[PDB]
Amino acid sequence: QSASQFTDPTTGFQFTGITDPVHDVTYGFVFPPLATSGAQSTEFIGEVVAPIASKWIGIALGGAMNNDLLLVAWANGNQIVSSTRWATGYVQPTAYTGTATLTTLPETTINSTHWKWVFRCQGCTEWNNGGGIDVTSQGVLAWAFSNVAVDDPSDPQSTFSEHTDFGFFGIDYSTAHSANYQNYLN
Amino acid sequence: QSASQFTDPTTGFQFTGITDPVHDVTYGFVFPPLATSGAQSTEFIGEVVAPIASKWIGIALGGAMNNDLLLVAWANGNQIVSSTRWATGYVQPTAYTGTATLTTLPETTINSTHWKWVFRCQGCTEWNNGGGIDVTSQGVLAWAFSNVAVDDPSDPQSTFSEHTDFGFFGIDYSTAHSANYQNYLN
Ligand code: HEM
Ligand code: HEM
Numbered sequence: 424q425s426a427s428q429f430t431d432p433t434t435g436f437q438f439t440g441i442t443d444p445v446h447d448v449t450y451g452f453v454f455p456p457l458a459t460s461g462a463q464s465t466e467f468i469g470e471v472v473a474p475i476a477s478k479w480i481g482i483a484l485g486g487a488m489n490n491d492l493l494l495v496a497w498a499n500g501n502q503i504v505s506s507t508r509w510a511t512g513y514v515q516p517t518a519y520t521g522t523a524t525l526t527t528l529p530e531t532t533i534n535s536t537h538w539k540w541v542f543r544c545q546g547c548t549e550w551n552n553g554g555g556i557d558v559t560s561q562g563v564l565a566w567a568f569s570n571v572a573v574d575d576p577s578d579p580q581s582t583f584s585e586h587t588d589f590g591f592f593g594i595d596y597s598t599a600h601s602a603n604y605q606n607y608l609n
Numbered sequence: 610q611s612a613s614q615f616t617d618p619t620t621g622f623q624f625t626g627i628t629d630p631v632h633d634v635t636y637g638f639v640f641p642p643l644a645t646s647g648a649q650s651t652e653f654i655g656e657v658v659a660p661i662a663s664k665w666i667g668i669a670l671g672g673a674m675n676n677d678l679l680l681v682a683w684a685n686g687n688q689i690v691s692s693t694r695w696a697t698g699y700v701q702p703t704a705y706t707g708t709a710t711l712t713t714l715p716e717t718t719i720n721s722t723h724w725k726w727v728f729r730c731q732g733c734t735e736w737n738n739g740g741g742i743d744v745t746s747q748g749v750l751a752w753a754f755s756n757v758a759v760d761d762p763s764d765p766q767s768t769f770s771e772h773t774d775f776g777f778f779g780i781d782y783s784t785a786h787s788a789n790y791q792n793y794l795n
């Protein structure tokens with residue numbers, strides 16, 4: 424599948440991403456302005472907009488399950504629980520051992536039909552194995568879905584069962600940068 | 610997703626299609642030679658190679674659930690049960706009333722781990738609603754998956770529940786024809 428640009432109707436944030444029509448989960452990404460005289464930033468802002476039957480969602484930032492930074496999140500009541508994780512094989516991803524900061528932004532909403540996680544991901548484009556994403560080029564992102572609750576929803580490091588679906592989408596990161604990035608943070 | 614050309618390693622048939630990595634079902638299509646002179650053929654050969662946990666599979670020949678010819682099939686023991694269907698709104702597709710003949714070809718194989726349905730679809734590029742597929746152009750195909758058994762597996766017109774997954778792929782019909790099509794038939 425292929426990402427495209429879209430606007431959050433509540434916030435007006437402008438993202439690049441997709442809506443999976445099966446689970447009707449929206450995934451959106453936006454990056455700071457491209458630098459020419461300095462190295463690129465290592466942070467980005469993203470969103471997951473998920474129907475409440477979505478019990479956990481994961482994002483694979485390198486487009487595959489293994490050896491890339493993963494983001495995992497779920498609703499637990501009126502709060503999002505989230506974590507940065509990693510998998511070396513096809514088994515339970517565990518806490519990421521590098522430096523990465525996931526911040527839930529206040530635009531994050533939970534209501535009766537959907538949870539909407541809006542986050543800041545710092546240190547998420549370069550990983551502690553030397554891998555990462557190139558925000559000036561084209562890449563692939565992937566997502567994981569489950570409709571089964573995590574084993575212990577109040578724990579960010581909870582274990583859980585294999586996703587019931589997963590998918591991919593191509594993204595041209597060179598088009599996903601925004602001059603309004605700073606304002607989104609504010 | 611995008612289709613590519615591949616060869617069936619047992620039969621040697623050359624198909625254009627994809628493998629869905631979630632349910633590990635392969636969808637392949639091959640068309641008779643394009644005509645330079647006159648109307649195109651209205652038939653094609655296809656295959657579904659599915660793990661036996663796949664309880665029913667559907668193919669949407671127009672790339673959508675509604676207003677296009679649908680093919681539905683499942684394993685019932687050591688036989689494939691299949692039918693042509695049509696959907697009026699997002700409800701249980703019913704028997705197609707147009708001109709289309711679905712034939713199970715002798716290459717069809719069912720074993721302990723997979724069912725491989727190889728079929729001939731005559732009259733399937735033009736539908737009795739006046740719609741159809743343009744075999745000289747680029748189009749979209751879709752598939753539907755369930756891991757739950759149909760309500761009556763011995764009935765080709767069995768009712769069944771909503772698919773648990775569905776997906777799409779782009780296909781360049783202009784490169785999906787084969788000079789060996791007639792040999793596939795004999
Ligand atoms: C206990 C939890 C997990 C288990 C046991 C697991 C298991 C697996 C297995 C067996 C596959 C191969 C499926 C196929 O190709 O047929 C797979 C693929 C995949 N998994 Fe997971 N997974 C889990 C958690 C996660 C999480 C949390 C994410 C994302 C944050 C994820 C993302 C992926 C992706 C995107 C793929 C497809 C691409 C690939 O083959 O690398 N998985 N997983
Ligand atoms: C009793 C059986 C069925 C029911 C109740 C049903 C229901 C639905 C529903 C509600 C959707 C919309 C999903 C969404 O976008 O979230 C849909 C989508 C779709 N269905 Fe079905 N379906 C059934 C059988 C089939 C069959 C047999 C096929 C193919 C042979 C099929 C192909 C598709 C496809 C391709 C889509 C996505 C594209 C589009 O929205 O038309 N469905 N179905």
Ligand SMILES: *[C@@H]1O[C@H](CO)[C@@H](O[C@@H]2O[C@H](CO)[C@@H](O[C@@H]3O[C@H](CO)[C@@H](O)[C@H](O)[C@@H]3O)[C@H](O)[C@H]2NC(C)=O)[C@H](O)[C@H]1NC(C)=O
Binds near residue numbers: 433472
């Ligand atoms: C619970 O959260 C969800 C997700 O944010 C809310 O649904 C979203 O609500 C917005 C605002 O109405 C929808 O945007 C609107 O879209 C329509 C259709 O094009 C357009 O006519 C409006 O002008 C506006 O742009 C958005 O589509 C919708 N998203 C989803 C996934 O449902 C929902 O409203 C929240 N529930 C409550 C009770 O507040």
Ligand SMILES: *[C@@H]1O[C@H](CO)[C@@H](O[C@@H]2O[C@H](CO)[C@@H](O[C@@H]3O[C@H](CO)[C@@H](O)[C@H](O)[C@@H]3O)[C@H](O)[C@H]2NC(C)=O)[C@H](O)[C@H]1NC(C)=O
Binds near residue numbers: 722
């Ligand atoms: C039941 O039928 C399925 C589908 O035909 C069998 O799986 C298929 O087995 C063939 C081998 O005859 C595989 O082709 C081989 O692939 C390997 C690796 O790519 C290659 O080295 C060989 O030269 C040959 O091309 C094919 O990949 C495989 N397809 C799938 C979807 O698994 C299955 O083995 C049969 N089961 C039993 C118990 O007979």
